[PDB]
């Protein structure tokens, strides 16, 4: 038994001149799998035609295009699709190109229109995201969580088949036995209590942690880094003033994911992320319970081999791909894809983390190239283990979880892949001179003392709208959508308050960052500094104001600034809409991991953590930074001062640093699937 | 920084006539390394003449076997002795069946002056050790703790590098500093911090329960163990009356030691015990910090191929072993060396145990063999990694070459987890108890609750004087005292309250066991995989009166644990005044209290207690010279001796589980011993 969860919703003004927009996007988006004749879109579709169109699209060439592959044509309907495939790559990228050069909102709802009634609805419900997300007359409007839209990628087979046969049967035949199988039928709907995989998916007592990694808000954060910035897409038009520091992001986001992951191998007493050796058998397990149209996801057999025939060429891209990053380290200063390199500098990180994400921007300065190849891909197929033929043959895929941005997190083979990623990053990083005592040490400024109220975790139940899985019927389509409610038990952790004591000398302002990092590794023995700057996460960074004398600041967990709340259900999205107000998390902080994953858990009842608390001067941003004001606090690089390796840890024992040693423990039931009808 | 262990010994008055031995023995045991001519013993080893005394000694055969056998010469002194190198071990028994057919007192202590004045030491220790243990006319004696009788296999490389030196340099020679390398001079002796062994030595995070499997009690059991019931020695000669129990002897004890190692893996969150292929390479990397007359031990890396050119024999050996007990399995019924067998009958357990030991008992039925192998031996050998050759002058030391550094290696535990695998296969032919055996008519337990359960380290310290080579001097007048001071695990005490209702009043038995909640991936275990996880740790009997009852059982009064041994200064104190350390005569093959329970955590670890009342029964009257260790007729384990199929027939209304949890108080770990620390 587990206590429901209950909060409030953060919820702002909508401007009056975006309530036409939101209405028709979530129109729109409405059984997505499906095309009903009867509505509006789908005569606009298919009486809508591109080419007469073509002067309401600023770009011609993107036009020309995509008549050409529409003319090659498309996938059919009723099948995967994935990002990762190349062809569906193609056509999904022009679709998306011809969406974003629309040059109204008018244009772009016909051709949305046009999309669903004739093309495949995987690539256009991926394309109208995209879109959303980054067109400019759209800024404002809130769209609905990805578990949501997907409900398929975030849920085991069989809670999926419940919900068919609830759906096939439109009911109950017997009701009362229906709570005895996890089903209850209550205000005019159907909620299904789920659990988390088993020992049968993860091996190596991993599934200890499943709680975690199938977390929808673990995946869903995942899913929104991909969106907000795309590997295919130009660094311009996804960020235009701060473009020259997207490898540097690319480094910050899976430092963090990795980072948080450790934390909870340690909560579970997991030990390290293991490595593996591409030429050798793979010792790591997978089968996932999880299927797309029927179609199992590929299962991996433990002790498979890697480096067979079949796949021998992309193995030696592979390792053709690091060792030129070696070679890379010995030159130093060199010149790659036409681009002139210093790896003295802390700047050269823009092009690492390009170099390691085969994004365009890599390939910015050589001329167009027709032969391209991305490390990521490769490995992501070779360690999915799916059939060679599935990849030889265009017209049939098996999926793998490997393939989605929704699902990637699930599989323990990605955090091992960007643990080698993010150690040959750190191997590059070992070049940076270490930050010195004058930039470090803030004369004038001492804290005195840190205080922290108790650090609690439990879980809850969590409720949410699953009806976009199912086929509706005609009559449903006209009246009403079946409500089907996955209820399912999820971390949460109670609010806790941190009180930072500062004597100051002089009066000024001063930027405060808080992280949390472990004390103990796997082997019970402590962690040293200068192994554990790339361990500690980024929690609070705000500015300050400090008068002479002492000086107290209390911030709430609720205020941290990398973290948003949850995201509301669709209902309650109508209902805040119906009175013209919409959620400013979902509107502007979704990019931000949930709060409700800041602590982890631990199978004791109790672990041991520290808190880092630093203190330094105030800069304002560059002005040409002034539409990401929200996004940046300051100019220094993300991760700061942990963002070079520390070599001497006493340079570190400063008047303006504090570490604290703090312990998390666990109110209620320790795990999750105490939720039968007879234990509730 | 750990509290400081002091508690007064419980000891009885010893009997004045046996006062004399006891002096001599101890006499016996002081600096055995080294040989002392200025010593009484000295003459008379020099002087004395085993064939001369040949009507000395009850048995003929005895002392000429042993005599041809020296007439072809012993092994030298100064070097390492093995009971698994074949020679060694065949002298050694030699040498130990002349100590235990000796006519009367006087022959056996010139016998032991004999072999310690000529033979090899560690030859002569063994044997003198289990004949003491074994000796009618020395029952009744106390003997030094095994840990400071071999203080080279209880401790790490550090802390004698570190007594070698004090020792060499007689002295500190600027003492105001060896403080901060954990060394402290006072009261006429030195004491040494020493730590547990780190990740270096265990992988794959073992290393989190060092502090447990080495123990120096956790090896001092197995030893003990090893020394009362020998497999080279026969049931009649060992055991007495409870020879056809030897099988399930064999059984409890390493079941029990396995579910132990496996409380704490889980205590520690390690998972369950790993299977292992001979044809395959064994997974677990260890690299001992011992050494024995400065000669290192062998050394085993992460992934070690078993197979090699130089063992295929021997795992020829291994396999065809393993694969006939199956062969038999399907058979049932079979004749297997000159003896019948029916695995139907639960009495077959002894051979089958027999079978797994290779003991002598196995061959009692046949004509004497030259032909001698040993499944445990070759297991052994195979596992210890040390390279292969057919000196016989020649030899590496593994962990595995002696009962006193066995359970320091993880390969103990697997080897002894597949052996009990197939015994537990074997078990699969047995009955499962009916509830006509199980119900207890009249008796229900209507309450269990227990106090508190609390775990902490605390700082222990034993003598290690005799790992050290002393000076003329120190011999003649006295040797200095090199003290290690270690923490170990313990327990505070706790009580377990039962509240049973029985309208008829009659005699019962109470057990009392702990076990698992949770598996290593965090679901519950049903009973049905569980059976062979749980600890006995309490067996007492009790008379039940109309009504209602209450029994109250004290931790410091649970049938199958004891107490701490103690040094041999305060042996020799209380002996001064006529007494003994009772728990070192009584009670001391059991494990220490200290160990009852694993590990806890600051939140809290989930265990179990299982409390069965049934009905009592006297034990035999044969079994009257062992009606110490006994207390009814049933089987060890019972009623988990054998498989539980149907957990619902085995739940009565006299059979009670409860939840518990165990804290532990202080530092959570044992590694906290600097001098900024303290
Ligand atoms: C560098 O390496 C080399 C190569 O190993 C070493 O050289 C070896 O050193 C050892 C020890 O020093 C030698 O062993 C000793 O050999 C002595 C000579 O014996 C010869 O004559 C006798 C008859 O008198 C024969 O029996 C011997 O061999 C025959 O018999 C043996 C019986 O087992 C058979 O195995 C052979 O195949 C032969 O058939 C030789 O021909 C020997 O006297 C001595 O034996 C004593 O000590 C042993 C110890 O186990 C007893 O068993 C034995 O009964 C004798 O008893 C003595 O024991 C102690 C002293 O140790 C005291 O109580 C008394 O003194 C008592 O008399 C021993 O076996 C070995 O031969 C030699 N190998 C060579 C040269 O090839 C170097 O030492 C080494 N150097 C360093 C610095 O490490
Ligand atoms: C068992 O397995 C077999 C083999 O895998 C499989 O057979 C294949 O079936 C698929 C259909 O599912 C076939 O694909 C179709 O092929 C026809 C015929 O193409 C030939 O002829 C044309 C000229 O007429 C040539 O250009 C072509 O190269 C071939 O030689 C096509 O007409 C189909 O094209 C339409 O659908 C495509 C999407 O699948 C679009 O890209 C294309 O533009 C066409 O679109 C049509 O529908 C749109 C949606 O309504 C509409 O908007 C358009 O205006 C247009 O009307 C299609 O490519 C394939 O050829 C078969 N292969 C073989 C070897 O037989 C079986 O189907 C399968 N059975 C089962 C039960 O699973
Ligand atoms: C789980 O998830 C499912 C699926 O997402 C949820 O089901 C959805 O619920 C919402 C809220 O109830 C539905 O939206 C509302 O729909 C009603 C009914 O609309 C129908 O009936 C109308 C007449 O009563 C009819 O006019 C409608 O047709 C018009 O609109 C379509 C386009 O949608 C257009 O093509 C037609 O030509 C018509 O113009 C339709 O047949 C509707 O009345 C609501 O409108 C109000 O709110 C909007 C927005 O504020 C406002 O603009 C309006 O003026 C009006 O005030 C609203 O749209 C949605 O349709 C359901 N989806 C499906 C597939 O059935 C379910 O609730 C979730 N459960 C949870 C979270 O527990
Ligand atoms: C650690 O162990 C050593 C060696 O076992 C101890 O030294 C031993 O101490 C005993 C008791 O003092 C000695 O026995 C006594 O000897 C005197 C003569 O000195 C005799 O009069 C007594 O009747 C008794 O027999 C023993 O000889 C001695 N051994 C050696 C080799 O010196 C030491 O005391 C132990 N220390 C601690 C703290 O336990
Ligand atoms: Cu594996």
């Given at each position: 038994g587990?206590p429901?969860?209950?909060?409030?919703?953060?919820?702002?003004?909508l401007?009056?001149?975006?309530?036409?927009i939101?209405?028709?996007?979530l129109?729109l988006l409405?059984?997505?799998?499906?095309?009903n004749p009867?509505?509006?879109?789908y005569?606009?579709?298919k009486?809508?035609?591109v080419?007469?169109?073509?002067?309401?699209?600023?770009?011609?060439?993107?036009v020309?295009?995509?008549?050409?592959?529409?003319?090659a044509?498309?996938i059919?309907?009723?099948?995967?699709?994935?990002?990762?495939?190349?062809?569906?790559?193609?056509?999904?990228?022009?679709?998306?190109?011809?969406?974003?050069?629309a040059?109204?909102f008018?244009?772009?709802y016909?051709?949305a229109?046009?999309?669903?009634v004739?093309?495949?609805?995987?690539?256009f419900?991926?394309?109208?995201?995209?879109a959303?997300?980054?067109?400019?007359?759209?800024?404002?409007?809130?769209?609905?969580?990805?578990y949501e839209?997907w409900?398929?990628?975030?849920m085991?087979?069989?809670?999926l088949?419940?919900i068919?046969?609830?759906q096939?049967?439109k009911?109950?035949?017997?009701?009362?036995?229906g709570?005895?199988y996890?089903?209850?039928?209550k205000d005019?709907?159907?909620?299904?209590?789920?659990?988390?995989?088993?020992?049968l998916?993860?091996?190596?007592?991993?599934?200890?942690?499943?709680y975690?990694?199938?977390?929808?808000?673990?995946?869903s954060?995942?899913?929104?880094?991909?969106?907000?910035?795309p590997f295919?897409?130009?660094?311009?038009?996804?960020?235009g003033?701060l473009?020259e520091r997207?490898?540097e992001?690319?480094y910050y986001v899976?430092?963090?994911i990795?980072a948080?992951?450790?934390?909870?191998?340690?909560?579970?007493?997991?030990?390290?992320?293991?490595?593996?050796?591409?030429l050798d058998?793979?010792?790591?397990?997978?089968?996932?319970?999880?299927?797309?149209?029927?179609?199992?996801?590929?299962?991996?057999?433990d002790?498979?081999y890697?480096?067979?025939?079949?796949?021998?060429?992309?193995?030696?891209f592979?390792?053709?791909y690091?060792?030129?990053?070696?070679?890379?380290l010995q030159?130093?200063?060199?010149?790659?894809?036409?681009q002139?390199?210093?790896?003295?500098?802390?700047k050269?990180?823009?092009?690492?983390?390009?170099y390691?994400?085969s994004?365009?921007?890599?390939y910015?300065?050589?001329?167009?190239?027709?032969?391209?190849?991305?490390?990521?891909?490769?490995?992501?197929?070779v360690?999915?283990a799916?059939?060679?033929?599935?990849?030889?043959?265009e017209?049939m895929?098996?999926?793998?979880?490997?393939?989605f941005?929704?699902?990637s997190?699930?599989?323990?083979a990605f955090?091992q892949?960007?643990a080698?990623?993010?150690?040959?990053?750190?191997?590059y990083?070992?070049?940076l001179e270490?930050?010195?005592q004058?930039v470090?040490?803030?004369?004038?400024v001492?804290?005195?003392?840190?205080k922290?109220?108790?650090?609690?975790?439990?879980?809850?139940?969590?409720?949410?709208?699953?009806?976009?899985?199912?086929?509706?019927?005609?009559?449903?389509?006209?009246?009403?959508?079946?409500?089907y409610?996955?209820?399912?038990?999820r971390?949460?952790n109670?609010?806790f308050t941190v009180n930072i004591?500062?004597?100051?000398?002089?009066?000024?302002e001063?930027?405060?960052?808080?992280?949390?990092?472990p004390?103990?590794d796997?082997?019970?023995?402590?962690?040293?500094?200068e192994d554990?700057?790339?361990?500690?996460?980024?929690?609070?960074?705000?500015?300050?104001?400090?008068?002479?004398?002492?000086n107290?600041?209390?911030?709430?967990?609720?205020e941290?600034?990398?973290?948003?709340?949850?995201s509301?259900?669709?209902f309650?999205i109508?209902?805040?809409?119906?009175?013209?107000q919409?959620?400013?998390?979902?509107?502007d902080?979704?990019?931000?991991?949930?709060?409700?994953?800041?602590?982890?858990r631990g199978t004791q009842?109790?672990?041991?953590?520290?808190?880092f608390v630093?203190?330094?001067?105030?800069?304002?941003?560059?002005?040409?930074?002034?539409?990401m004001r929200?996004?940046?606090?300051?100019?220094?690089?993300?991760?700061?001062?942990?963002d070079?390796?520390?070599?001497?840890?006493?340079?570190?024992?400063?008047?303006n640093?504090?570490?604290?040693?703090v312990?998390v423990?666990?109110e209620?039931?320790?795990?999750?699937?105490?939720?039968?009808?007879?234990?509730? | 920084?750990?509290?400081?262990?002091?508690?007064?010994?419980?000891?009885?008055?010893?009997?004045?006539?046996?006062?004399?031995?006891?002096?001599?023995?101890?006499?016996?045991?002081?600096?055995?390394?080294?040989?002392?001519?200025?010593?009484?013993?000295?003459?008379?080893?020099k002087?004395?003449?085993?064939?001369?005394?040949?009507?000395?000694?009850?048995?003929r055969?005895?002392?000429?076997?042993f005599?041809?056998?020296?007439?072809?010469g012993?092994?030298?002194?100064?070097?390492?002795?093995?009971?698994?190198?074949?020679?060694?071990?065949?002298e050694?028994?030699?040498?130990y069946?002349?100590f235990?057919?000796?006519?009367?007192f006087?022959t056996?202590?010139?016998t032991?002056?004999?072999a310690?004045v000529?033979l090899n030491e560690?030859?002569?220790?063994?044997?003198?050790?289990?004949?003491?243990?074994?000796?009618?006319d020395?029952?009744?004696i106390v003997l030094?703790?095994?840990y400071?009788?071999?203080?080279?296999?209880?401790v790490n490389?550090d802390?004698?590098?570190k007594i070698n030196?004090?020792?060499?340099?007689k002295?500190?020679?600027?003492?105001?500093?060896?403080?901060?390398?954990?060394?402290?001079?006072?009261?006429?002796?030195?004491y040494?911090?020493?730590?547990?062994?780190?990740?270096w030595?265990?992988?794959?995070?073992?290393?989190?329960?060092?502090?447990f499997?080495?123990?120096?009690?956790?090896?001092?059991?197995?030893y003990?163990?090893?020394?009362?019931?020998?497999?080279?020695?026969?049931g009649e000669?060992?055991?007495?009356?409870?020879?056809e129990?030897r099988?399930?002897?064999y059984?409890?004890?390493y079941?029990?030691?396995?579910?132990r190692?496996?409380?704490?893996?889980?205590?520690?969150?390690?998972?369950?015990?790993?299977?292992?292929?001979w044809?395959?390479?064994?997974?677990?990397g260890?690299?001992?910090?011992?050494?024995?007359?400065?000669?290192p031990?062998?050394?085993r890396?992460?992934d070690?191929?078993?197979?090699?050119?130089?063992?295929?024999?021997?795992?020829?050996?291994?396999?065809?072993?393993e694969?006939?007990?199956?062969?038999?399995?399907?058979?049932?019924?079979?004749?297997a060396?000159?003896?019948?067998?029916?695995?139907?009958?639960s009495?077959s357990?002894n051979?089958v145990?027999?079978?797994?030991?290779?003991?002598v008992?196995?061959?009692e039925?046949?004509?004497?063999?030259?032909?001698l192998?040993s499944?445990?031996?070759?297991?052994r050998?195979?596992?210890?990694?040390?390279?292969?050759?057919?000196?016989?002058?020649?030899?590496?030391?593994?962990?595995?070459?002696?009962?006193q550094?066995?359970?320091?290696?993880?390969?103990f535990?697997?080897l002894?987890?597949?052996?009990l695998?197939?015994?537990?296969?074997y078990?699969?032919?047995?009955?499962?108890?009916?509830?006509?055996?199980?119900?207890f008519?009249?008796?229900?337990?209507?309450?269990v609750?227990?106090?508190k359960?609390?775990?902490?380290?605390e700082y222990?310290?034993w003598?290690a004087?005799?790992?050290?080579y002393?000076?003329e001097q120190?011999?003649?007048?006295?040797?200095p005292?090199?003290?290690?001071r270690?923490?170990?695990?313990?327990?505070?005490?706790?009580?377990?309250?039962?509240?049973?209702?029985?309208?008829?009043?009659?005699?019962?038995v109470?057990?009392?066991?702990?076990?698992?909640?949770?598996?290593?991936?965090?679901y519950?275990?049903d009973?049905?995989?569980?059976?062979?996880n749980?600890?006995?740790?309490?067996?007492?009997?009790?008379?039940?009166?109309?009504?209602?009852?209450?029994?109250?059982r004290?931790?410091?009064?649970?049938?199958?644990?004891?107490e701490?041994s103690?040094?041999?200064?305060?042996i020799?104190?209380?002996?001064?005044?006529?007494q003994?350390?009772?728990y070192?005569?009584?009670?001391?093959?059991?494990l220490?209290?200290?160990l009852?329970?694993?590990?806890?955590?600051?939140?809290?670890?989930?265990?179990?207690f299982?409390?069965?009342?049934?009905?009592?029964?006297?034990?035999?009257?044969?079994?009257?010279?062992?009606?110490?260790?006994?207390?009814?007729?049933?089987?060890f384990?019972?009623?988990?001796?054998?498989?539980?199929?149907?957990?619902y027939?085995?739940?009565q209304p006299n059979?009670?589980?409860k939840?518990?949890?165990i804290?532990?108080?202080?530092?959570?770990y044992?590694?906290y011993?600097?001098?900024?620390?303290?």
């Amino acid at each position: 038994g587990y206590p429901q969860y209950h909060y409030d919703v953060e919820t702002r003004k909508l401007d009056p001149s975006l309530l036409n927009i939101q209405t028709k996007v979530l129109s729109l988006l409405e059984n997505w799998k499906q095309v009903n004749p009867d509505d509006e879109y789908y005569k606009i579709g298919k009486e809508y035609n591109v080419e007469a169109n073509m002067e309401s699209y600023t770009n011609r060439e993107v036009v020309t295009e995509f008549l050409s592959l529409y003319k090659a044509g498309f996938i059919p309907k009723n099948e995967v699709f994935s990002i990762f495939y190349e062809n569906q790559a193609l056509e999904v990228i022009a679709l998306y190109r011809l969406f974003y050069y629309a040059k109204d909102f008018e244009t772009f709802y016909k051709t949305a229109a046009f999309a669903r009634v004739w093309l495949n609805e995987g690539q256009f419900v991926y394309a109208f995201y995209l879109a959303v997300i980054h067109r400019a007359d759209t800024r404002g409007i809130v769209l609905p969580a990805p578990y949501e839209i997907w409900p398929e990628y975030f849920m085991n087979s069989d809670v999926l088949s419940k919900i068919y046969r609830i759906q096939m049967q439109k009911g109950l035949i017997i009701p009362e036995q229906g709570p005895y199988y996890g089903i209850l039928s209550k205000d005019n709907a159907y909620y299904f209590y789920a659990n988390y995989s088993g020992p049968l998916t993860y091996e190596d007592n991993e599934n200890l942690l499943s709680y975690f990694i199938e977390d929808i808000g673990w995946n869903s954060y995942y899913y929104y880094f991909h969106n907000r910035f795309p590997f295919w897409e130009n660094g311009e038009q996804l960020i235009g003033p701060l473009k020259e520091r997207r490898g540097e992001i690319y480094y910050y986001v899976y430092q963090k994911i990795l980072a948080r992951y450790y934390l909870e191998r340690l909560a579970n007493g997991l030990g390290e992320i293991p490595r593996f050796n591409w030429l050798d058998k793979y010792q790591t397990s997978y089968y996932p319970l999880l299927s797309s149209y029927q179609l199992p996801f590929a299962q991996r057999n433990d002790d498979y081999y890697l480096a067979s025939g079949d796949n021998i060429n992309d193995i030696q891209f592979i390792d053709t791909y690091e060792k030129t990053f070696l070679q890379l380290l010995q030159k130093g200063q060199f010149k790659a894809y036409k681009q002139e390199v210093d790896l003295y500098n802390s700047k050269s990180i823009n092009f690492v983390g390009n170099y390691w994400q085969s994004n365009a921007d890599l390939y910015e300065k050589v001329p167009k190239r027709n032969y391209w190849r991305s490390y990521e891909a490769t490995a992501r197929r070779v360690l999915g283990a799916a059939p060679r033929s599935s990849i030889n043959y265009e017209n049939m895929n098996i999926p793998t979880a490997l393939d989605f941005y929704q699902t990637s997190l699930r599989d323990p083979a990605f955090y091992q892949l960007y643990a080698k990623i993010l150690d040959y990053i750190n191997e590059y990083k070992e070049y940076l001179e270490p930050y010195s005592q004058d930039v470090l040490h803030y004369v004038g400024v001492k804290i005195n003392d840190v205080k922290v109220d108790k650090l609690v975790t439990y879980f809850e139940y969590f409720d949410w709208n699953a009806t976009n899985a199912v086929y509706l019927s005609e009559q449903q389509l006209d009246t009403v959508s079946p409500s089907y409610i996955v209820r399912q038990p999820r971390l949460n952790n109670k609010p806790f308050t941190v009180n930072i004591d500062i004597k100051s000398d002089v009066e000024s302002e001063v930027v405060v960052k808080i992280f949390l990092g472990p004390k103990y590794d796997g082997n019970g023995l402590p962690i040293s500094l200068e192994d554990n700057w790339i361990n500690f996460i980024e929690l609070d960074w705000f500015t300050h104001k400090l008068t002479s004398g002492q000086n107290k600041i209390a911030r709430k967990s609720e205020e941290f600034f990398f973290f948003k709340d949850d995201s509301v259900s669709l209902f309650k999205i109508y209902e805040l809409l119906s009175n013209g107000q919409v959620p400013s998390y979902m509107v502007d902080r979704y990019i931000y991991l949930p709060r409700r994953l800041i602590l982890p858990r631990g199978t004791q009842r109790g672990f041991p953590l520290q808190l880092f608390v630093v203190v330094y001067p105030y800069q304002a941003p560059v002005k040409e930074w002034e539409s990401m004001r929200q996004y940046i606090v300051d100019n220094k690089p993300f991760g700061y001062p942990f963002d070079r390796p520390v070599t001497l840890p006493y340079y570190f024992n400063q008047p303006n640093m504090y570490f604290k040693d703090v312990y998390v423990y666990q109110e209620g039931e320790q795990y999750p699937y105490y939720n039968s009808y007879w234990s509730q | 920084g750990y509290p400081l262990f002091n508690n007064n010994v419980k000891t009885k008055t010893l009997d004045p006539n046996l006062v004399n031995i006891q002096k001599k023995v101890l006499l016996l045991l002081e600096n055995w390394k080294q040989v002392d001519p200025d010593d009484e013993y000295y003459k008379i080893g020099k002087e004395y003449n085993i064939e001369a005394n040949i009507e000395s000694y009850t048995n003929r055969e005895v002392v000429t076997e042993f005599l041809s056998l020296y007439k072809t010469g012993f092994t030298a002194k100064n070097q390492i002795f093995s009971i698994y190198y074949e020679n060694q071990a065949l002298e050694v028994r030699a040498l130990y069946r002349l100590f235990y057919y000796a006519k009367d007192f006087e022959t056996f202590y010139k016998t032991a002056a004999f072999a310690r004045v000529w033979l090899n030491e560690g030859q002569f220790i063994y044997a003198f050790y289990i004949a003491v243990i074994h000796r009618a006319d020395t029952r009744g004696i106390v003997l030094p703790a095994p840990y400071e009788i071999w203080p080279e296999y209880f401790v790490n490389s550090d802390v004698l590098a570190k007594i070698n030196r004090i020792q060499m340099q007689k002295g500190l020679i600027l003492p105001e500093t060896a403080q901060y390398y954990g060394v402290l001079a006072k009261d006429n002796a030195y004491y040494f911090y020493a730590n547990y062994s780190g990740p270096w030595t265990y992988e794959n995070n073992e290393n989190l329960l060092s502090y447990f499997i080495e123990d120096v009690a956790w090896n001092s059991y197995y030893y003990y163990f090893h020394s009362k019931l020998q497999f080279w020695e026969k049931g009649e000669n060992a055991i007495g009356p409870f020879k056809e129990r030897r099988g399930e002897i064999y059984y409890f004890i390493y079941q029990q030691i396995l579910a132990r190692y496996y409380l704490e893996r889980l205590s520690n969150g390690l998972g369950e015990i790993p299977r292992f292929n001979w044809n395959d390479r064994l997974q677990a990397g260890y690299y001992p910090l011992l050494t024995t007359h400065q000669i290192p031990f062998a050394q085993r890396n992460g992934d070690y191929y078993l197979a090699n050119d130089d063992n295929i024999e021997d795992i020829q050996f291994v396999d065809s072993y393993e694969k006939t007990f199956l062969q038999f399995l399907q058979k049932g019924q079979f004749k297997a060396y000159k003896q019948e067998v029916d695995l139907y009958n639960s009495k077959s357990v002894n051979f089958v145990g027999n079978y797994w030991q290779a003991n002598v008992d196995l061959y009692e039925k046949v004509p004497q063999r030259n032909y001698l192998r040993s499944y445990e031996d070759a297991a052994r050998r195979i596992l210890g990694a040390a390279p292969r050759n057919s000196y016989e002058n020649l030899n590496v030391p593994t962990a595995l070459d002696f009962y006193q550094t066995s359970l320091r290696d993880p390969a103990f535990y697997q080897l002894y987890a597949k052996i009990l695998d197939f015994i537990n296969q074997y078990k699969e032919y047995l009955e499962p108890y009916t509830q006509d055996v199980l119900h207890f008519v009249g008796v229900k337990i209507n309450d269990v609750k227990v106090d508190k359960l609390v775990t902490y380290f605390e700082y222990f310290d034993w003598n290690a004087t005799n790992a050290v080579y002393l000076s003329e001097q120190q011999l003649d007048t006295g040797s200095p005292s090199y003290i290690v001071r270690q923490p170990r695990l313990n327990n505070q005490p706790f009580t377990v309250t039962i509240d049973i209702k029985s309208d008829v009043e009659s005699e019962a038995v109470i057990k009392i066991f702990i076990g698992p909640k949770y598996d290593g991936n965090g679901y519950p275990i049903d009973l049905e995989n569980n059976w062979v996880n749980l600890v006995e740790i309490d067996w007492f009997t009790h008379k039940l009166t109309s009504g209602q009852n209450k029994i109250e059982r004290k931790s410091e009064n649970f049938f199958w644990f004891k107490e701490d041994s103690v040094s041999v200064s305060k042996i020799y104190e209380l002996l001064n005044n006529g007494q003994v350390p009772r728990y070192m005569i009584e009670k001391f093959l059991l494990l220490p209290r200290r160990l009852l329970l694993p590990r806890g955590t600051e939140g809290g670890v989930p265990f179990q207690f299982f409390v069965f009342v049934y009905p009592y029964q006297a034990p035999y009257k044969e079994w009257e010279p062992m009606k110490e260790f006994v207390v009814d007729n049933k089987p060890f384990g019972y009623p988990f001796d054998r498989p539980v199929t149907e957990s619902y027939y085995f739940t009565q209304p006299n059979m009670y589980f409860k939840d518990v949890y165990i804290y532990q108080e202080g530092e959570e770990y044992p590694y906290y011993t600097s001098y900024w620390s303290q």
